[PDB]
């Protein structure tokens, strides 16, 4: 059993570039709709005071990169002198102590100078990803950066793609507690058959996620697969019919429509050709229906002889000739 | 739909019938061939009269009018047979010469039942009205004879 | 909640609904079941109208008609009412249609009455209060009465 | 007698994996729909200044546990000499200073490293809780933490559950008054039986909470009973009808 549901394509990784310091827009360096590669620069903002930022931690690492000179020379100087006794070794204590607080204070100087570096390079906007990018939604010479992270593009992996489509709850339900009876097969091997309305084309998935919660407003469950998309076609949020299997049906009967006849209470009943062609009622239960047969869960064996035809004029009990 | 609207199937009317306000059903039929409607219509009220009670019965339409007709022939037959009567009295100046000529009736519907009867026909308003007409001309007939009588 | 609410809440709610049969025509080749799709819209009883769901939240708290309104089954009007010898009661008055027959008509009324008697309830008994029909019914025996003498 | 109330199916444990820093989703290191344990790496975001904030830091304390070396070696030579003499009582009180100072000032930076760590930390998105997660709401390449905190994930524990649902006001208020009247005896130890619409799956509870406050909306209370979910059968947010026992 297969079921059509509603879906749309998703791209796999989406990168929403947005500036982190607050400037004006100098330079557009790339154009819109090409690839794009991770590393390469988008916007060019200007930096009037992360490069005074910069400017000042280097100063301050090279301040105290000639405490760590003077301190280095000190020591280097004590240590001979400290073996013939010339200084005491409090003093060669002390410059030690001076020259690893000097190392210290120049790591601390480099981390800064490493912040301030990384908070200017944060207005070199790169991308994150490789993949397509869409419109820039700020122009050159545009304000961003302030109170909020300005949107300024957005890049997309068009393969492989998802199909988020979704299921309603109850339905899945019935499919579980069918599972569990051994009524139907699991069918998670199956590929997933994708389809875009009001085209021909068709491409084959895999199912990859089903959701845990169901929906409160709709009542339903998302479901998430997974779909090769090398040649570009399947576009993201593009409306889309998943295919999905509703599972194994391993001795499903299908029987002609026209055969089952149902009773005021609503049961469904057959007619069958028994010993001595002798019509027999059997009662039997109606699962899903394919086109103009319906599919018995219950009440019917293989080999059994169903009367198609006739029924209204055949009483139970009455002698027929099978044609 | 599926999240709150379940399928359960039941068995219904396809068609209503109502007749005078109560629910009714349709019966139809015909009789068999060389079977009249009127005994069959006596068999029906038979069986219906073993209904049980409360279950009713109406005739409509061709039965309707076969009711009514088979109802008036009788007064029909009287009105026709008084007025001759009346008119024979008045033409004779006597009573003894009509009693007389209308003893002929019997006679030409003796030749109108044996007629119908020999080749088979029912008593249907065509034979009916020709047994009538030859009443009329058999009257003629006697007449013919009883005033120069 | 305002009145307007319950107002449109109530007919909303209480729709008969003309859903339609499955495998109409157009239909197409393969299938062959047209059945109906009989939808409940109306109600029936007191208890289902106070049902009538008029404010729900989305963790499942109702309000109820039944919550705000007594729900019962009542006249349509009230502004006539019927007593008889201090005691309530139903009554209808029949007008005569022009050009009809008085004694037949009074007594085919009397006599319909008398047949549904077989159908009343225990508890309830008919009776005419009121009936012209016996005045003229005596006033032509009295006139007849002078015609013999 | 039993009252059937609409309810809902709500997890035990909802853990909402937000963003507490700002940088982009390098990696997701785990997969859609699978069980994760408390601790476990989910997101991987980008440590650009966490990890220099914690050089700065691990530096500052290179700084102090050097002046606390010079203390100790200072306090180490003035402790016998004093015992003869050698130098005045003041000047070793004044080491002895200085070197508790430089203790103090050891475990002060210690601290601020260990603020640093737990800062940077904060950047391997780890599991709160055991549990079932959904689908990201991020990718990876998505700047997170950037003003709010960029909801990533959500973590549901499926087993027990607890199912809430409503009872009118006026009949918990006649209930209650039937048995102060003693008409009705209390079923506080009735089971609950939840039963879910459409199906024959039928689960016992037992009745945790009876609410206090009536909703304003609707004039209905709200009640929680708890139910067991060993084959999670029972999803999150599914409507279900529990029959209470009403005494």
Redesign the interface.
Known sequence: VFAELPGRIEPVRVAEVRARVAGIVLKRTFEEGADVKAGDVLFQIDPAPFKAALSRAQGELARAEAQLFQAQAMVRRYEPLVKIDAVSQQDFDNAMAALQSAQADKRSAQANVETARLDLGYAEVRAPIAGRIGRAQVTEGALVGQGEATLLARIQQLDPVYADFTQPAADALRLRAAIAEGKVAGASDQPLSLRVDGTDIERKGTLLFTDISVD??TGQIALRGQFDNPEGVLLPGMYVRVRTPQGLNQNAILVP??AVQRSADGQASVMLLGEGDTVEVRQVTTGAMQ??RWQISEGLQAGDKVITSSLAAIRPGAKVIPR | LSAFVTTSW?E?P?QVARYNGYPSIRIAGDAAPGVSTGEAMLELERIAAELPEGIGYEWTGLSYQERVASGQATMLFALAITVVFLLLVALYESWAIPLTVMLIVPVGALGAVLAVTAIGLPNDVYFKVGLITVIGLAAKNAILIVEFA | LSIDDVNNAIRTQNVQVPAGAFGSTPGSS????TA?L?VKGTLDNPEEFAAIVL?????????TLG?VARIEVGSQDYNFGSRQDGKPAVAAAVQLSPGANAIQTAEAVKQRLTELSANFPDNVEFSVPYDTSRFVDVAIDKVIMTLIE
């Open positions: 409160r407003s429509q026209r086109g103009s | 039941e219904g396809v | 393969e299938q062959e079941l109906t009989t404010r729900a939240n989305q963790d499942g708290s109702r309000l919550d």
